[PDB]
Structure formats: C-alpha cells, structure tokens
Design a protein around this ligand. Sequence first.
Ligand SMILES: CCCCNC(=O)c1cc(S(N)(=O)=O)c(Cl)cc1SCCc1ccccc1
Ligand SMILES: CCCCNC(=O)c1cc(S(N)(=O)=O)c(Cl)cc1SCCc1ccccc1
Ligand SMILES: [Zn+2]
Ligand SMILES: [Zn+2]
Lengths: 260, 260
Amino acid sequence: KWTYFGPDGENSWSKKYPSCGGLLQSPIDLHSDILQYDASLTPLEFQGYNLSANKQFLLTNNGHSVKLNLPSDMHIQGLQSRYSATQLHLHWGNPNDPHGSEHTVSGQHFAAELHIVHYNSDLYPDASTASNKSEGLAVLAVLIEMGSFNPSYDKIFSHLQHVKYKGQEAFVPGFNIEELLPERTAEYYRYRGSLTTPPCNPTVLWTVFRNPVQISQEQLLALETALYCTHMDDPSPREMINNFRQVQKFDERLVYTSFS
Amino acid sequence: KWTYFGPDGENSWSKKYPSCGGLLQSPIDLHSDILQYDASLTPLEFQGYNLSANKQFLLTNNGHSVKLNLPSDMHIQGLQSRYSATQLHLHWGNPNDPHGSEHTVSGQHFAAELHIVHYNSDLYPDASTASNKSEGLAVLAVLIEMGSFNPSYDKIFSHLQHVKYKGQEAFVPGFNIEELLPERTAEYYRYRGSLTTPPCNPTVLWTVFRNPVQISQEQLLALETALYCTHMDDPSPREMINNFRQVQKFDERLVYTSFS
Ligand SMILES: CCCCNC(=O)c1cc(S(N)(=O)=O)c(Cl)cc1SCCc1ccccc1
Ligand SMILES: CCCCNC(=O)c1cc(S(N)(=O)=O)c(Cl)cc1SCCc1ccccc1
Ligand SMILES: [Zn+2]
Ligand SMILES: [Zn+2]
C-alpha cells in the first residue's frame, strides 16, 4: 500500500518497495542537454491496435488510476522482442492545478499522460511475471495538453462514472487504440527506466512520443473529479488526483531521440 | 550514510531520516500560480557579513558539498528572531548538464545554488540543536547562472584545489559575504520548508532571492569538476556532482513574494 500524498507518498515508497530507491527510475525531465540522436530508432508498428467496436474491454479503478485491459494480440513490432499489450491507464493533476503529466519537457508538465503498457511476450507469459525481470516491459507515453475535445479519449472518459471507486469495473466498447496516439509517432524519445509506480522495477523500455495530443478542459475536469482511490464503503474516502511521480535523477543515462 | 545516487539516494533518505518523507519538504518549483505578493515582506539586513580579510575561515569538503564555516556574530535582522550564521555551502549539477540548483523558477534549473544557513540564536545555542526545533533555521538562497566572472565567488572557488577530497580542510581570508548576494535583495521568495538534506527537518524559513548572480563558464566548471565525495585514497573515487535534491510536491500552499 502506497499513495501520491503524505506518509505513504513517493518519498516513502522505497521503505516497502526497494526498487523505488534504486537506479534507472522514471519519470524524467526531457531537456536538450541529455538528448542524443540515434539512427537505430526506426518507426514502431502498432499491430492489432484496431479493437472491434462490437467487442468489450474491461475498464477498472485499481485505486491508483483508471486502467483499460488490452488483449495480448495487440502488440508492438520494432523492438528487440515482441512486446504484447496488457493495459493502458492515465496520470493527471487536479481541477486547481491541471498539470499532472509524469514526464516533463524542459521542466514543463503537460495536463496529463497516457501509458500503454506492454510485456515481453517472447520471454514471459504476462506483465505480472515480466515486471521484475530483465527486458520485461515497454510503455508508449502520450503527453496530453488541454485543447480541443477528443472523441477518441472520450471512448474512455464517458465510462468513468461506472468506475468511481476502487475495484469497480465496467465493459467499454473496443475502438482503434491508435486514435490515442499523436501525429508523427516516428518522432519519439527512448530511454531505460522503471515503473513510475511501486514496485518501481527498472525493467521498462520507455518510448515517449515527441508530439502531444489534446483533450478539452471539460474532459480533464471529468477525469480529475470522477475517481476515488478508495472503496465505495471507505469512511476516509480519497480523491484520485495528482497521481504522478516527481521526475527522478538521470543516474548517468541519456535519452535517445529518433529526431535531430 | 546518505548520497544523491545509488541505493542510499534521496528516495531512500526516509528510511533512516523519517522527516524526508514528511510535511513541508524543500526544495520546490517557484511558479506564478503558487506566488502571492505580501506587501508586509520588508528588506532583510545582513549584519557582520563584512569579514576581516585578516581573519581566516574554514572551508571543508564533507562529501555532500563544500562548506565555508561562518562566525555566529554574523546575522540577519528583519525576522521575528535573530538568526546567526553557521555555514554556507553550494549545490551544482555536472558539466554535460550544468543545471544543479535545488529551487526551480517556472520549472527551470539555474546552474547552481548557494545556501547561507542561519539558526535561531535567540532560542538555541547552535545550528545542530536548532535544526530539529520550531523556527530553528533560516536559509538565504542565491540562484547562480553562467555569465561574467565573479571576483567575490572566486574568493571561494580559488581554494577548491585544497579540499578536492572528503575530509580535506582549508582557510579563506574573510571577504564581504554580502558580495555573494545578487542585486535587489529586497526582492525575494519566502516560504516555510525543510533542510534539502537529511535529516530533512521541516524547520527552515526559506528566502530565495528573485535575481540570480552570474559566475563565468570557467568558475562553474571548476566547481562541477574540482571535488570528489570520496577520501583522497578511496580506491574507487566518485566525482562530487548532482548534489541537489529533486523538487518536492507543494500541495495547497503559497510562496509569498516581497515583489508585486
Ligand atoms: C500493480 C499496481 C500498481 C499500478 N501501476 C500499474 O498498473 C503500472 C504502471 C506502469 S507505468 N506507470 O510505469 O507506465 C507500468 Cl510500466 C506497469 C504497471 S502494471 C504491470 C506490471 C505489473 C503487474 C502486476 C504486478 C506488478 C507489476
Ligand atoms: C550534517 C548535515 C549534512 C549536510 N547538510 C547541511 O550542512 C545543511 C544543509 C541545509 S540546506 N541544504 O537545506 O540549506 C541546511 Cl538548512 C542545514 C544544514 S546543516 C545545519 C543543521 C544541522 C547540523 C547538524 C546536524 C543536523 C542539522
Ligand atoms: Zn503509468
Ligand atoms: Zn543547501
């Protein structure tokens, strides 16, 4: 058990989850001095992203974020192994401070952040088994900026009202998960890092897209007001807000870019 | 034992230093939405900061920073108690990434940060005894950027050669310590926080001057490269770099400004 605020917050994670106080932690601040162009970084292909709108996918409040379960037929080609999808989820701030991206760019938070989590299906049978193992995970990160209404993101946000409390679950119709990605997915940052949550294992190949996507003010307000970290019956209910980790020391890492 | 790197890093400080996971942690990002002008914040007076050049003061490498011992006769006038000087020390980054201030303005790191540590000499005999007590400590924080050669900061940096390693000590003719302060010291940020180092006690009244000082690219490089955090005959030397804490979450609070 852990939170983003007070005694159980991120400065205390390492007391229960030692990897949280180890090396190669995420997120990080993307800034010119630590960037390095790499000709190796070829375009990813997103296979099986186009989920049938006549099929149903489990959305869950896990007490930390809202998660959408993804089928393992969904995958990434282009890395050293096949990375199969396990779930996507978000990180955001609060109505009075809508700047809850995990990754920052030249010291600036975006409004929110989407993480599409994949596991090494060539090595491991699921994300859970893969999470504490070498080369176990790969995440696509989309930075989210406040702008126009996003009908694609709304295929998640219109469902939040059925997963208000921890452990609540709701079937959501499939849609093309590629619609959540920004323009020019060929332009990305790539670095070796960790889960941004406990148990913080340094097993994550990070891809952060260069370009953000936009969702409206009304979409962020809904995301920032709809969810609780706590069970429906908890007498000390806590709002699910500011569910982002502070950026971490580089530990001599560089971030490789597909662009110069 | 505590460091800015590896398993004994800042995410692990809370294990042996509980306060590092507690309330009112420094440093923080100073940005517009958390600033509030308070017309009641008048100028500090720096008394006995003009040290005899015929008096000598101990410079030490403690393996966390380089520290100049200061005489208690020097103090700040303007607060509700007299705060007497104990030491000044610095925080910096590394030559590939020369952005190692502790406090940030609008998410931006300055090259470095000087701290002049004072203690409540009306209530407490010493900084050690004051450190974990109400209204114990007051720091003057100076943000340092690349710029023109600074003769006054060179009165310190000219002696780094003699304190290369953990343990080494050296003497510095006195100079006017007010010479290390920027222009318009009437302009400052003010907030209650913590030591940025273990034991992280929430006992510090922070005064961060609005205006940075400038040191030359060569002065900054000397600081970043002159010192080690290991003993002169450690087999495995460690360069003393990136000796700054990551900014902390600053939830539902204000930094007050002396400036509109
Ligand atoms: C186990 C509950 C903690 C909540 N975190 C995640 O679901 C999560 C977050 C990330 S992140 N924010 O770095 O993108 C990642 Cl990369 C993976 C997971 S969960 C999948 C791995 C796992 C499964 C089961 C137990 C432990 C880990
Ligand atoms: C034994 C302490 C280890 C190193 N830290 C400092 O000297 C230090 C740093 C700051 S900061 N970076 O917040 O300006 C401050 Cl406010 C005070 C001290 S040391 C003075 C207080 C103290 C002395 C002895 C034991 C504990 C605290
Ligand atoms: Zn995440
Ligand atoms: Zn300091």
